[PDB]
């Protein structure tokens, strides 16, 4: 019943615009944050908002609520790698509480080809390259 | 089963010590202009204090020069918002439908109290707004009313007793008249 | 100072060590809408017709207390442990309703100007002591941040009964005696 | 801050798990959570003081205790494959708002003992075709054949690590996807100009951290046992 996140997983190329749904029970709530699990680390907090207003925009970061809608997201500018994490949306009354107290959590979010050699300091393994870039798989 | 919402107190970074978190609404006209006030006090040094009408966290005394800093950064945010999500919400949703919404019939009597002392006995109301008169045959007396403060019993009651100093002629017709609003019709005490 | 229609006074903690002491209370132009009690975990409605209509969560003044014991802790030292200076609680005794021989009445104790928040009020009938019908409030605050409290009696008017209300506490010599008679 | 012993515990099916966490933000509420991929952020118990712990998303078989403001405890009183996951910790109070989440623990249970192994560390030298052509030098490391997947590889230049120009599986690979176990494979990219892969007096080396029985585990099979160790290869230009 409590919050879907949406969408669960997503591409974007590298200077695109990224942007995160979500909605509530729950009912008005006064708490809706951000996320960022960097990859193979902890979750820590970039952005929130409260019903107090509907746009808040901070240092790269673009947050929207709709109170009546029961729905608020998540949008950045001109991305990089450094902005792929799984992101984590969750909402909460503010305070006082309670049951629903605090957090929830949703569901969570030279093109110049080569083939190279490399051996042993005998055996080998060889490359797919600049499709930085590169990969390895063997049999 | 509509929730109230508590105002919330920030953290920080044979002889008894005390600490008092005072978060205080104030509402004039309404909602139409809501204040928000959160004091805090060492024992009875308010040190440092919120105010919405100044917008940031100051100290008040030297002993708070310190906590001013911290807070403004790690709440400020969120206590801007409490007036709007918990002072406001407060209001009404939870104060219409109760407080704003008490009415309690006062409760009129008169007596003999020791030439002596009449005393009309305003009793049980609510809320405090009030008035009483004292018509001995028809006319105000102005003279020898000497009444209480407004008591308060502190049970969402009040009373208050209003003196009159006379002496008994014949038999004559005195007149505790009383004015509340949870009367629509003036209550109106007889004696001897 | 300060100009208004009416105050809600929502959210107040109140922490006092060593003992442990706490206590979190709401209230409206004066008059406690309720306080949590600390042990059970429970909010405890002033008149429980307010209990019907709406709920506050408790664990919420639980966080309150929790914020308050911290700063306790962090401004006893920053002021030099210099401890907190016993006021004289000042006591009234009035009654409810007019008195009447053989009608049920309330004494009240109201006591002000006291601080630290503990005191102890009692009563006695003709000095043999009594507890049964009654009730005693929270601690409720003032504008020079100490507290007043109230006690009720349950009587039934009579001769000749003889009413004290009695006060303890830290701030006086000997206990303070409330003489009252119908 | 927060921490977490352990960091990564590997189990025995019908055993007994504690983990600690130890808050020292002086806060008042702390949560364990446990991230699964496909199941997300699930809330497993949690407290809101020293004494109390209340039930939280998906509190079954996972009874919590918390004996402390600093500490916090979850509890597994008899393992099962199922209970294999990430743990989390994080802390928040007076008065908020902001979870402090903790670094993070790989817990692993197993039904068995039989197919565990540590990981052999081989470390490739680029083609002399690369140094030519793009006029700088690209070191490849690879470590095979070890149960279970939780591995974490790193490099080291002058006896220094060293992030620049590293890429690294994000994620394993199984070597039969087919059968059941089926131990996992990993790799692992390194680079630098083409004036530190001639010259000698630089010192590479590939690592990798492998997490496999601590001390106290009761070792059967007559192989060397399998045990939390460092494991190197280097190079010199």
């Given at each position: 019943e409590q919050v879907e996140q949406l969408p669960s997983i997503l591409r974007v190329q590298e200077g695109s615009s990224a942007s995160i749904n979500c909605s509530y029970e729950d009912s008005a709530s006064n708490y809706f944050p951000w996320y960022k699990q960097e990859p193979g680390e902890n979750p820590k907090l970039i952005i929130d908002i409260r019903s107090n207003m509907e746009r808040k925009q901070t240092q790269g970061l673009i947050v929207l609520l709709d109170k009546k809608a029961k729905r608020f997201s998540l949008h950045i500018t001109d991305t990089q790698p450094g902005d792929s994490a799984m992101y984590f949306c969750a909402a909460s009354r503010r305070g006082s509480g309670g049951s629903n107290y605090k957090l929830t959590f949703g569901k969570g979010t030279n093109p110049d080809p080569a083939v190279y050699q490399l051996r042993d300091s005998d055996k080998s393994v060889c490359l797919f390259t600049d499709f930085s870039n590169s990969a390895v798989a063997w049999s | 089963?509509?929730?109230?919402?508590?105002?919330?107190?920030?953290?920080?970074?044979?002889?008894?010590?005390?600490?008092?978190?005072?978060?205080?609404?104030?509402?004039?006209?309404?909602?139409?202009?809501?204040?928000?006030?959160?004091?805090?006090?060492?024992?009875?040094?308010?040190?440092?204090?919120?105010?919405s009408d100044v917008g940031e966290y100051r100290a008040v005394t030297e002993l708070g020069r310190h906590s001013a800093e911290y807070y403004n950064k790690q709440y400020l945010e969120r206590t801007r918002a409490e007036l709007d999500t918990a002072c406001r919400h407060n209001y009404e949703e939870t104060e219409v439908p109760t407080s704003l919404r008490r009415l309690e019939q006062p409760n009129v009597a008169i007596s003999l109290s020791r030439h002596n002392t009449l005393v009309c006995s305003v009793t049980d109301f609510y809320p405090a707004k009030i008035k009483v008169r004292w018509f001995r045959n028809g006319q105000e007396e102005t003279v020898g009313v000497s009444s209480t403060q407004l008591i308060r019993n502190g049970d969402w009651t009040f009373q208050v007793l209003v003196m009159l100093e006379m002496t008994p002629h014949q038999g004559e017709v005195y007149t505790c008249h009383v004015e509340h609003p949870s009367l629509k019709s003036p209550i109106t005490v007889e004696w001897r | 100072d300060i100009e208004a229609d009416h105050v809600g006074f929502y959210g107040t903690t109140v922490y006092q060590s060593p003992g442990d002491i706490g206590q979190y209370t709401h209230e409206f132009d004066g008059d406690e809408l309720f306080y949590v009690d600390l042990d059970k975990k429970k909010t405890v409605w002033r008149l429980p017709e307010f209990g019907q209509l709406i709920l506050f969560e408790p664990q919420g003044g639980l966080q309150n207390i929790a914020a308050e014991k911290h700063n306790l802790g962090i401004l006893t030292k920053r002021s030099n442990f210099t401890p907190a200076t016993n006021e004289a609680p000042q006591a009234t005794v009035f009654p409810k309703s007019p008195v009447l021989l053989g009608q049920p009445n309330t004494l009240i104790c109201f006591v002000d100007n006291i601080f630290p928040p503990v005191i102890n009020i009692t009563w006695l009938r003709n000095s043999k002591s009594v507890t049964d019908g009654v009730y005693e409030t929270s601690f409720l605050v003032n504008r020079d941040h100490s507290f007043h409290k109230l006690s009720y009696l349950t009587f039934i008017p009579s001769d000749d009964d003889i009413y004290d209300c009695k006060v303890e506490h830290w701030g006086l010599e000997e206990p303070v005696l409330k003489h009252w008679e119908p | 801050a927060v921490t977490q012993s352990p960091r990564n515990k590997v189990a025995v099916t019908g055993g007994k798990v504690t983990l600690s966490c130890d808050q020292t933000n002086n806060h008042n509420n702390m949560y364990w959570y446990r991230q699964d991929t496909g199941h997300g952020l699930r809330l497993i118990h949690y407290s809101y003081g020293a004494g109390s712990t209340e039930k939280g998303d998906i509190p079954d078989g996972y009874k919590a205790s918390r004996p402390s403001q600093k500490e916090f405890s979850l509890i597994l009183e008899l393992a099962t494959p199922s209970q294999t996951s990430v743990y989390f910790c994080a802390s928040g109070g007076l008065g908020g708002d902001e979870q402090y989440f903790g670094p993070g623990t790989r817990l692993t249970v197993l039904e068995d003992l039989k197919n565990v192994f540590p990981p052999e560390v081989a470390v490739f030298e680029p083609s002399e075709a690369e140094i030519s052509h793009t006029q700088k030098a690209t070191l490849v490391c690879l470590a095979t054949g070890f149960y279970p997947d939780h591995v974490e590889l790193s490099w080291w230049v002058n006896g220094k690590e060293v992030h620049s120009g590293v890429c690294t599986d994000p994620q394993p690979l199984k070597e039969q996807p087919a059968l059941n176990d089926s131990r996992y494979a990993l790799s692992s990219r390194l680079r630098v100009s083409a004036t530190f892969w001639q010259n000698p007096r630089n010192h590479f080396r590939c690592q990798v951290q492998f997490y496999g029985l601590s001390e106290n585990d009761e070792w059967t099979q007559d192989r060397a046992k399998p045990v939390t160790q460092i494991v190197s290869a280097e190079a010199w230009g």
């Amino acid at each position: 019943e409590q919050v879907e996140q949406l969408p669960s997983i997503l591409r974007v190329q590298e200077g695109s615009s990224a942007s995160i749904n979500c909605s509530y029970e729950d009912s008005a709530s006064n708490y809706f944050p951000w996320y960022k699990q960097e990859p193979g680390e902890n979750p820590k907090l970039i952005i929130d908002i409260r019903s107090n207003m509907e746009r808040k925009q901070t240092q790269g970061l673009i947050v929207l609520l709709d109170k009546k809608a029961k729905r608020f997201s998540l949008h950045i500018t001109d991305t990089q790698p450094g902005d792929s994490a799984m992101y984590f949306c969750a909402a909460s009354r503010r305070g006082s509480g309670g049951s629903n107290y605090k957090l929830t959590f949703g569901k969570g979010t030279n093109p110049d080809p080569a083939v190279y050699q490399l051996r042993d300091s005998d055996k080998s393994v060889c490359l797919f390259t600049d499709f930085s870039n590169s990969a390895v798989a063997w049999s | 089963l509509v929730e109230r919402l508590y105002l919330v107190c920030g953290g920080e970074g044979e002889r008894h010590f005390v600490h008092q978190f005072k978060g205080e609404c104030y509402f004039t006209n309404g909602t139409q202009r809501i204040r928000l006030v959160t004091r805090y006090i060492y024992n009875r040094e308010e040190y440092l204090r919120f105010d919405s009408d100044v917008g940031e966290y100051r100290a008040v005394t030297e002993l708070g020069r310190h906590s001013a800093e911290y807070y403004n950064k790690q709440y400020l945010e969120r206590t801007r918002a409490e007036l709007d999500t918990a002072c406001r919400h407060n209001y009404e949703e939870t104060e219409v439908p109760t407080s704003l919404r008490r009415l309690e019939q006062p409760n009129v009597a008169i007596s003999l109290s020791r030439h002596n002392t009449l005393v009309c006995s305003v009793t049980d109301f609510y809320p405090a707004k009030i008035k009483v008169r004292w018509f001995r045959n028809g006319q105000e007396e102005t003279v020898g009313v000497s009444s209480t403060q407004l008591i308060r019993n502190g049970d969402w009651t009040f009373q208050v007793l209003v003196m009159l100093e006379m002496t008994p002629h014949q038999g004559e017709v005195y007149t505790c008249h009383v004015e509340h609003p949870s009367l629509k019709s003036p209550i109106t005490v007889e004696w001897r | 100072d300060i100009e208004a229609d009416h105050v809600g006074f929502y959210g107040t903690t109140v922490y006092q060590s060593p003992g442990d002491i706490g206590q979190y209370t709401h209230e409206f132009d004066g008059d406690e809408l309720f306080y949590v009690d600390l042990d059970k975990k429970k909010t405890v409605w002033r008149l429980p017709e307010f209990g019907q209509l709406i709920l506050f969560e408790p664990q919420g003044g639980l966080q309150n207390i929790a914020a308050e014991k911290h700063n306790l802790g962090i401004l006893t030292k920053r002021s030099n442990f210099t401890p907190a200076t016993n006021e004289a609680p000042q006591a009234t005794v009035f009654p409810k309703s007019p008195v009447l021989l053989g009608q049920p009445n309330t004494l009240i104790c109201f006591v002000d100007n006291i601080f630290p928040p503990v005191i102890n009020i009692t009563w006695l009938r003709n000095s043999k002591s009594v507890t049964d019908g009654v009730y005693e409030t929270s601690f409720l605050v003032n504008r020079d941040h100490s507290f007043h409290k109230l006690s009720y009696l349950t009587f039934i008017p009579s001769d000749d009964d003889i009413y004290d209300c009695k006060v303890e506490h830290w701030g006086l010599e000997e206990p303070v005696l409330k003489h009252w008679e119908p | 801050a927060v921490t977490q012993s352990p960091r990564n515990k590997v189990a025995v099916t019908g055993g007994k798990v504690t983990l600690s966490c130890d808050q020292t933000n002086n806060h008042n509420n702390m949560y364990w959570y446990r991230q699964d991929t496909g199941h997300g952020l699930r809330l497993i118990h949690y407290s809101y003081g020293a004494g109390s712990t209340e039930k939280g998303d998906i509190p079954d078989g996972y009874k919590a205790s918390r004996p402390s403001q600093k500490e916090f405890s979850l509890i597994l009183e008899l393992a099962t494959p199922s209970q294999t996951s990430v743990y989390f910790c994080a802390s928040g109070g007076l008065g908020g708002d902001e979870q402090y989440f903790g670094p993070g623990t790989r817990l692993t249970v197993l039904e068995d003992l039989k197919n565990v192994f540590p990981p052999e560390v081989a470390v490739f030298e680029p083609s002399e075709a690369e140094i030519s052509h793009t006029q700088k030098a690209t070191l490849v490391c690879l470590a095979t054949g070890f149960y279970p997947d939780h591995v974490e590889l790193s490099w080291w230049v002058n006896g220094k690590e060293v992030h620049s120009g590293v890429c690294t599986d994000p994620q394993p690979l199984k070597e039969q996807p087919a059968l059941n176990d089926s131990r996992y494979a990993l790799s692992s990219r390194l680079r630098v100009s083409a004036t530190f892969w001639q010259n000698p007096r630089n010192h590479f080396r590939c690592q990798v951290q492998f997490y496999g029985l601590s001390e106290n585990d009761e070792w059967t099979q007559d192989r060397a046992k399998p045990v939390t160790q460092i494991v190197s290869a280097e190079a010199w230009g």
